[PDB]
Design a protein around this ligand. Structure first.
Ligand code: CLA
Ligand code: CLA
Ligand code: CLA
Ligand code: CLA
Ligand code: CLA
Ligand code: CLA
Ligand code: CLA
Ligand code: CLA
Ligand code: CLA
Ligand SMILES: CC1=C[C@H](O)CC(C)(C)[C@H]1/C=C/C(C)=C/C=C/C(C)=C/C=C/C=C(C)/C=C/C=C(C)/C=C/C1=C(C)C[C@H](O)CC1(C)C
Ligand code: SF4
Ligand SMILES: [Ca+2]
Lengths: 42, 743, 221, 208, 81
């Protein structure tokens, strides 16, 4: 468990998880507001 | 002396301690990172087992377990294939009308407007067309519904899990001992008979029961869903009796040696099936039966435990003549104590085998409705060609690694290797001369033709209408092949392939499957170009292997190791003297050779083979036979091949093939990017990184792990990797777009 | 002590300490030398004994229903061959009080309890006489030898108070297990090629020896 | 803590993990993956199991008693699975938000106590109340323990807590089973029980 | 189909090959082959009951090769006559 946590935070694994989360977030934002070329709210 | 099962219990206990420590294998790496270079090293030596330790037993155990892991990966890949075919494919629609529907087994979710890639492939389906040729394999196997594909996918997943567990269990619970790995006689006996022979017998048994009756029903016109299930043909035997009467007697012809009675489904026809455009399945079943017999016999050669057999040492040491001293004496000990020797031999053989597979597979198509699927044919040929070339280059890499590391005349002395190392200078000098001579006469003729055409002197050109260079030998050989059936090979009705001759063009669904391929002056020139490129790459690789240990420049090159940047700017400069650098150059030359080979194949097929048949039998070829007259000059290759056929890929924007144009441009980019690494040195980059690091130090944001520039060898490796990726990917996109739009 | 087709290397580790030891190990699987997972000699002996026991059960059982199906009140529909009971649904099924699949799950739960307890006894001998189990654990102690646990449950009649009786009884047990085991192999292959059933096959063969093995080589199904 | 070397085990004949020494209520040594090895993680998991158990016991009661009650013509609770959309006095979102703030307050109090034991037992409005419970996960007090049934000897409280955790595990499995049944079948848990009891041999999983 | 030309040919072939194997005439399990001219004597490990050291592996191998040669001869003869 402790060693699993340690290995699960090593550079490659942490980076892949971070970028998967970022990709999912951006994908969902684009899905809800697609084809957005300007900021119209204000 | 005897062959038995030897293992050791619990050599390594499964745990997570070493996961937390990056690079446990190397002591200095285990200590920790001082600079960023460390990180790269950690990956560069991940699978270099023979360097982390020196015990043969540990290396062998690691190799066995890694083999299990890779086998698990392959099984997972196959399970993914079968699942995608089962769920995200139009396999049944294609099965109902093969020539009508374009195979596809991949859809893309609609997220950022990428749904344009879900093109109209037919059969009420929208997806990405696949050129892997899986649909033809499934049709040839007798798969008719998606339930069978689902079952195969689940089974492959289970076998992937089993492979993974086997790897874990064999490395951590029961690790075979060294004497077990060194038992090569029994290994060869089992692989020849237990694996190849028995596997071929099993596949022949499947083909007799499932492939033959199912494909016969399919070709008779029965709808796929109305066909009896593959198991019924086993329960009730009259089902088989109807298609082939000889099943009525059942096995008694096989045991009374009345094998002629099995001529119904065990034939020697040859050629192609006029309906499906592939090899007769009754020929393939007989093929696999004969192969099974041959391998089951050949796997009884080497002695294991019962006296009868052959000792490989005896066979090796019994061969030697006046020109080679005591040759073959000592090779058995070399090949059973060094893994790199075996790896190099096997890599060379597998690369050659893959190349031969490509050649034979486009020569006579073995799957139904594969010949007229031009995209599949082109993609399969090109893929196998590239795989074979890479494996052959790896053969040289590992031969050089063995030469540097495991070669030792004090303890393991071989006579043939000694003589080769003693006249390497003559070998390489003559090979260099051959390379120069071939280069001048193959490419020089192209330059001559180009210059004559530019000067308005077509009568002086080396063409079919000016000065002919007819390959008389190849023409004679293929003529002898055309006349073969009924003369020299009486039992065959049709020639081995339709490329030999004899006319008998074969077409399917209005498309040309195959017809005789003519050989002329352009074929002569391109074949000599092929010979030139192969010889030059062989020169590079052989020179790297032979001069790996020492030369007249650096007499102690072995002490530096297999991989190292140089030996300083002394003696005029010793850049790229190591064997690894020779492999690095051989990669470029292999890329050149394979690119020319695939270009020749594509243009020749389009010009003289592929095309559309019409009612009167007038064949209109994709390219109107311009290869014979345009391929003899470089300007023709640049204009009538690259420029003309790039239109399909460059226009792909706005359609389902837009991804191919995107990959075309991206591959161009990555290839040009590689030149950044291939042309520069690390000193400039380190000096620039110094200023960057200072800029970071000014803001208290400098990394603790000091950022060093890439090592020299790493710079070369990155350059070659990017070069190969970019070139191969741009050719991939070009071929796929061209043949999908025009095919 | 007679030996059949033994090997000098096999004679080394096959000395006679196990019942039915005829020195027959040309293959050499029982290597100790090489000892490993599931290849350890004691595990192999245990597997031989257990497989022989199950095969004896299955050989007396698979032949029974189609025997008394000819003699006795037993219903005609109830008596079928060992392959038509629903073991191989393609070859025939039957309608019991359950689905054939829930039957499998129930069989599996019960057999799992039994076999898990047996194995946990094999690994750490005598470990099943400790934890509670509605009582009955004092009878699940064991006897050191896993293949022969004994006790009030597995040996209530108290056969073989002396040791020789046990020795010869073990010899008879292993011989009968091998016999029934090879006989079940015969069951399988006969029912495959001949497809009639073992008892009816015996009856039609004993009418006259016209029904040879070579006769069935035509292979109807 | 009373470490019981010879407690009954989940897998008879196998040694329990070192980190499970029988201190916790309802310890049978079940930790194949070894998730709770780290002491702090062990405490966190114990709290998680307790809260999951209590939530699941409430859920099992409120899913099964009402439907066993409406199967017999006593009252008319609808199907639990589809009970989320039947419109009430207001829309579901407002109820969700108002419920969210309240349960967030309660869970924040619980979190503060978990990560700092005995630091939130006093009522912030009237500082003369004080929850009596001195154990993390067992607040006690007049609110969560008005009857004071479980304040006697530690040994008695130990087995009472074991009863609690065992009933909780059963409830968790029960609720998950009800969910999986309603998604697999298309009826209610009481309907499934009645059908299976009518045909114990054929009305099972293998009916599809 | 018993006693027929094919059965007789296969019999005689297998019987002759096995007879050669049991005696000299061929490379037995206990008899090494030098270069196809002389046969040396060795002990393969597995013990034999037959006086001439004819092991079970030896008889299996001799039978198998006898069947191979018989099948070849019979098939050729039936192919031409
Ligand atoms: C399932 C649990 C498990 C656990 C806890 C361990 C634990 C351990 N193993 Mg082990 N192993 C396992 C399963 C396991 N293994 C299996 C299933 C196999 C068969 C393949 C092996 C075969 C094996 C070998 C041969 C060796 C070890 C070694 C080790 C030790 C060194 C660190 C390490 O694991 O490497 C690092 C951990 C990783 C996760 C590395 C990644 C490896 C996977 C296979 C990559 C997946 C490939 C991927 C698809 C590539 C495509 C890339 C793409 C995704 C971009 C360590 C104690 C080494 C050792 O003991 O040193 C003396 C040793 O040499 N293991
Ligand atoms: C400098 C390079 C560059 C720039 C400036 C842009 C800019 C843009 N791209 Mg683009 N793109 C690029 C490179 C670039 N791209 C490359 C190299 C590729 C190939 C992989 C793509 C492929 C691509 C696609 C497929 C799409 C875009 C789209 C877009 C637009 C979407 C804006 C958005 O996501 O909504 C707004 C996002 C946010 C507001 C997220 C931030 C909010 C955070 C999470 C919360 C902060 C709270 C405080 C935007 C104008 C999308 C589009 O519709 O174009 C019009 C789209 O479909 N791009
Ligand atoms: C490993 C390959 C393999 C396998 C597993 C099988 C398996 C089988 N074959 Mg077969 N067979 C094979 C190769 C194989 N064959 C080859 C290469 C040939 C050509 C010589 C034949 C020719 C053949 C015939 C003529 C018959 C079988 C039959 C059978 C079945 C008979 C079972 C039985 O009743 O007893 C069985 C499932 C019989 C059958 O069809 O079952 C009803 C039968 O009639 N086989
Ligand atoms: C079964 C085939 C096989 C096997 C088992 C091996 C095994 C081995 N090779 Mg070898 N090799 C092979 C084929 C093979 N090779 C072939 C075909 C070639 C010709 C290309 C080479 C050329 C070669 C060289 C030059 C060297 C080795 C070396 C080694 C050893 C260490 C490799 C390592 O772990 O470094 C680390 C491995 C990596 C860092 C992985 C590289 C990742 C590649 C470049 C990316 C691939 C890109 C992908 C295909 C597409 C893009 C995806 C991306 C965008 C996400 C190891 C024992 C090294 C050695 O020292 O020998 C002792 C070494 O110097 N090999
Ligand atoms: C190339 C694949 C391969 C190879 C060469 C081996 C080779 C071996 N395995 Mg193995 N195994 C494999 C795949 C493989 N296995 C897979 C995929 C699994 C998962 C199902 C297993 C699971 C497995 C187990 C559980 C065991 C072996 C064992 C063994 C060893 C003795 C087996 C034996 O007695 O003969 C074959 C015997 C038959 C009855 C057939 C032997 C060295 C045994 C061992 O560890 O040796 C001590 C052992 O018990 N294997
Ligand atoms: C985690 C525990 C829990 C939860 C979240 C719910 C939630 C719910 N119950 Mg329920 N209930 C529970 C436990 C629970 N119950 C228990 C332990 C019992 C006794 C066995 C009941 C007996 C019960 C009945 C008889 C009814 C509900 C009903 C309802 C629903 C609407 C009325 C309401 O909001 O409750 C009440 C809110 C109060 C503030 C009081 C609602 C979704 C009603 C329903 O089915 O919806 C129409 C209904 O009639 N419950
Ligand atoms: C059968 C399940 C069960 C059992 C055995 C226990 C047992 C216990 N609980 Mg617990 N509890 C449960 C369910 C259970 N609880 C559920 C579902 C919840 C969520 C509402 C809680 C919430 C809870 C809290 C917040 C606290 C306890 C506390 C306690 C302990 C103090 C003495 C006591 O009066 O408790 C119960 C004694 C019983 C004999 C069980 C009574 C069962 C009733 C009568 C069921 C009636 C039917 C119902 C209305 C429907 C005791 C060991 C307190 C504690 O730890 O002391 C410091 C405490 O702080 N419980
Ligand atoms: C936790 C107690 C529990 C109980 C008493 C039941 C009882 C029942 N279930 Mg159910 N089930 C449970 C949990 C439980 N389930 C869980 C956790 C799941 C999720 C996997 C399911 C999923 C499930 C499905 C999908 C179905 C049932 C069905 C049924 C009914 C017929 C049995 C059957 O064929 O399905 C077999 C159920 C299983 C194999 C899963 C049970 C395994 C868990 C771990 C419980 C083990 C029992 C435990 C050791 C002893 C219980 C104590 C006491 C009550 C005796 C039956 C009345 C079927 C039905 O509706 O009837 C037609 C049905 O379709 N269950
Ligand atoms: C005892 C007398 C006898 C006789 C009269 C025959 C007669 C015949 N045999 Mg035969 N054979 C015999 C014994 C005999 N055989 C024995 C004992 C064996 C076991 C070794 C065989 C094994 C055998 C095989 C495997 C084959 C024959 C075949 C044939 C027929 C054609 C061969 C031929 O002449 O074409 C001339 C053949 C060649 C010139 C071979 C050239 C091709 C090779 C492969 C090229 C070299 C490549 C290589 C890798 C190097 C022919 C009627 C063939 C057949 O099936 O007939 C239809 C066949 O394939 N026989
Ligand atoms: C030893 C060795 C070693 C050396 O070295 C070499 C060699 C020689 C190779 C070898 C060999 C071996 C062998 C051959 C073995 C065999 C075995 C078997 C057969 C088993 C069975 C085994 C068998 C078994 C268990 C069985 C069991 C059975 C059972 C349960 C049954 C059940 C049943 C019945 C009743 C009937 C019904 O209706 C159905 C069922 C339900 C099905
Ligand atoms: S330029 Fe680089 S590779 Fe060449 S001698 Fe100098 S350091 Fe070595
Ligand atoms: Ca051994």
């Amino acid at each position: 468990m402790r060693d699993l946590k340690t290995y699960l935070s090593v550079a490659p694994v942490a980076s892949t998880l971070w970028f998967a989360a970022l990709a999912g977030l951006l994908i969902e934002i684009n899905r809800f507001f697609p084809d957005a070329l300007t900021f119209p709210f204000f | 002396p005897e062959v038995k099962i030897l293992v050791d219990r619990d050599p390594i206990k499964t745990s997570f301690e070493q996961w937390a420590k990056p690079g446990h294998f190397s002591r200095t790496i285990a200590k920790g990172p001082d600079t960023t270079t460390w990180i790269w090293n950690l990956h560069a030596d991940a699978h270099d087992f023979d360097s982390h330790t020196s015990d043969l037993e540990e290396i062998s155990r690691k190799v066995f377990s890694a083999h299990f892991g890779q086998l698990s990966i392959i099984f997972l890949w196959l399970s993914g294939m079968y699942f995608h075919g089962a769920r995200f494919s139009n396999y049944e629609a294609w099965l109902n009308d093969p020539t009508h529907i374009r195979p596809s087994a991949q859809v893309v979710w609609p997220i950022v407007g990428q749904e344009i890639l879900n093109g109209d492939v037919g059969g009420g389906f929208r997806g990405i067309q696949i050129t892997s040729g899986f649909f033809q394999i499934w049709r040839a196997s007798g798969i008719t519904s998606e339930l069978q594909l689902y079952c195969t996918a689940i089974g492959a997943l289970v076998f992937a899990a089993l492979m993974l567990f086997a790897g874990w269990f064999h490395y951590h619970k029961a690790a075979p001992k060294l004497v077990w790995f060194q038992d090569v006689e029994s290994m060869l006996n089992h692989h020849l008979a237990g694996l190849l022979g028995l596997g071929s017998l099993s596949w022949a048994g499947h083909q007799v029961h499932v492939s033959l009756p199912i494909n016969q029903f399919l070709n008779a016109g029965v709808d796929p869903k109305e066909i009896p299930l593959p198991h019924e043909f086993i329960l009730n035997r009259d089902l088989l009796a109807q298609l082939y009467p000889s099943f009525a007697e059942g096995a008694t012809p096989f045991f009374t040696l009345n094998w002629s009675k099995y001529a119904d489904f065990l034939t020697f026809r040859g050629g192609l099936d006029p309906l499906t455009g592939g090899l007769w399945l009754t020929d393939i079943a007989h093929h696999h039966l004969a192969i099974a017999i041959l391998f089951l016999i050949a796997g009884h050669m080497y002695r294991t435990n019962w006296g009868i057999g052959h000792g490989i040492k005896d066979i090796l040491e019994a061969h030697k003549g006046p020109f080679t001293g005591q040759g073959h004496k000592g090779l058995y000990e070399i090949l059973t104590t060094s893994w790199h020797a075996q790896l190099s031999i096997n890599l060379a053989m597998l690369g050659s085998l893959t190349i031969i597979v490509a050649h034979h597979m486009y020569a006579m198509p073995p799957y139904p409705y594969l010949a007229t699927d031009y995209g599949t044919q082109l993609s399969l040929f090109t893929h196998h060609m590239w795989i074979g070339g890479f494996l052959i280059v790896g053969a040289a890499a590992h031969a050089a690694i063995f030469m540097v590391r495991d070669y030792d005349p004090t303890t393991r002395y071989n006579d043939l290797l000694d003589r080769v190392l003693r006249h390497r200078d003559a070998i390489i000098s003559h090979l260099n001369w051959v390379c120069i001579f071939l280069g001048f006469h193959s490419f020089g003729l192209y330059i001559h033709n180009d210059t004559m055409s530019a000067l308005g002197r077509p009568q002086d050109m080396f063409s079919d209408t000016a000065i002919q260079l007819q390959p008389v030998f190849a023409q004679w050989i293929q003529n002898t092949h055309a006349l073969a059936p009924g003369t020299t090979a009486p039992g065959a009705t049709t020639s081995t392939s339709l490329t030999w001759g004899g006319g008998d063009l074969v077409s399917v669904g209005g498309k040309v499957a195959l017809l005789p391929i003519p050989l002329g002056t352009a074929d002569f020139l391109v074949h000599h170009i092929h010979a030139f490129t192969i010889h030059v790459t062989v020169l590079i690789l052989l020179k790297g292997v032979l001069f790996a240990r020492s030369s007249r420049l650096i007499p102690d090159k072995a002490n530096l190791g297999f991989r190292f940047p140089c030996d300083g700017p002394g003696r005029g400069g010793t850049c790229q003297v190591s064997a690894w650098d020779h492999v690095f150059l051989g990669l470029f030359w292999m890329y050149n050779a394979i690119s020319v080979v695939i270009f020749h194949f594509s243009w020749k097929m389009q010009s003289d083979v592929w095309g559309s048949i019409n009612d009167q039998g007038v064949v209109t070829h994709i390219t109107g036979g311009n290869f014979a007259q345009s391929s003899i000059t470089i300007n023709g290759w640049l204009r009538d091949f690259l420029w003309a056929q790039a239109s399909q890929v460059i226009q792909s924007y706005g359609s389902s093939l837009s991804a191919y144009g995107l990959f075309f441009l991206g591959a161009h980019f990555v290839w040009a990017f590689s030149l950044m690494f291939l042309f520069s040195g690390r000193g400039y980059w380190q000096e620039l990184i110094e200023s960057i690091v200072w800029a970071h130090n000014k803001l208290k944001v400098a990394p603790a792990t000091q950022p060093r520039a890439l090592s020299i060898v790493q710079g070369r490796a990155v350059g070659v990797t990017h070069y190969l990726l970019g070139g191969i990917a741009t050719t991939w996109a070009f071929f796929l777009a061209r043949i999908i739009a025009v095919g | 002590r007679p030996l059949w087709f033994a090997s000098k290397q096999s004679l080394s580790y096959l000395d006679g300490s196990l019942p039915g030891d005829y020195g027959f190990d040309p293959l050499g699987l029982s290597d100790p030398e090489g000892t490993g997972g599931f290849i350890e000699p004691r595990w192999l002996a245990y597997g031989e004994v257990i497989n022989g026991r199950f095969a004896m059960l299955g050989a007396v059982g698979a032949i029974a229903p189609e025997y008394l199906g000819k003699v006795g009140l037993i219903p005609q529909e109830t008596a079928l061959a060992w392959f038509q009971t629903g073991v191989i649904p393609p070859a025939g099924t039957y309608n019991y009080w359950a689905d054939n699949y829930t039957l499998f799950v129930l069989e599996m739960a019960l057999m799992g309890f039994a076999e898990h307890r047996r194995f946990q006894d094999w690994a750490k001998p005598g470990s099943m006489g400790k934890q509670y189990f509605l009582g009955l654990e004092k009878g699940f102690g064991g006897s050191g030898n896993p293949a022969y646990p004994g006790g009030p449950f597995f040996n209530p009649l108290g056969f073989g108070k002396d040791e020789k009786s046990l020795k010869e009884l073990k010899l008879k047990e292993v011989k009968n297990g091998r016999l029934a085991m090879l006989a079940i192999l015969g069951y399988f292959i006969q029912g495959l090629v001949t497809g009639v059933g073992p008892y009816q096959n015996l009856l039609d063969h004993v009418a006259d020896p016209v029904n040879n093995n070579v006769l069935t080589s035509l292979k109807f199904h | 803590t009373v470490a019981e070397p010879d407690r009954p085990l989940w897998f008879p004949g196998s040694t329990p993990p070192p980190w499970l020494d029988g201190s916790l209520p309802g310890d049978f040594g079940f930790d194949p993956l070894g998730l709770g090895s780290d002491p702090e993680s062990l405490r966190w998991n114990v709290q998680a199991e307790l809260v999951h158990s209590r939530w699941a016991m409430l859920g099992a009661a409120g899913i099964f008693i009402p439907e066993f009650l409406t199967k017999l013509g006593i009252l008319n609770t609808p199907s639990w699975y589809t009970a989320g959309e039947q419109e009430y006095f207001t829309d579901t979102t407002t109820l969700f938000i108002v419920e969210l703030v309240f349960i967030g307050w309660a869970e924040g109090r619980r979190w503060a106590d978990i990560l700092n034991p005995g630091c939130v037992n006093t009522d912030p409005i009237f500082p003369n109340n004080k929850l009596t419970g001195t154990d993390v996960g067992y607040p006690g007090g007049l609110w969560f323990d008005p009857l004071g049934w479980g304040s006697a000897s530690p040994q008695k409280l130990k087995e009472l807590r074991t009863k609690e955790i065992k009933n909780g595990r059963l409830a968790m499995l029960a609720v998950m089973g009800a969910w999986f049944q309603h998604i697999y079948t298309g009826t209610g848990p009481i309907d499934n029980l009645f059908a299976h009891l009518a045909d114990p041999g054929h009305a099972t999983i293998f009916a599809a | 189909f018993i006693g027929s030309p094919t059965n007789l040919i296969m019999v005689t072939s297998t019987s002759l090959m096995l007879f050669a194997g049991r005696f000299g005439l061929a490379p037995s399990a206990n008899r090494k082959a030098t270069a196809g001219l002389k046969l040396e004597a060795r002990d393969s490990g597995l013990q034999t009951g037959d006086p001439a050291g004819f092991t079970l592996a030896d008889t299996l191998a001799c039978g198998v090769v006898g069947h191979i040669i018989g099948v070849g001869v019979v098939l050729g003869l039936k192919n031409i006559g």
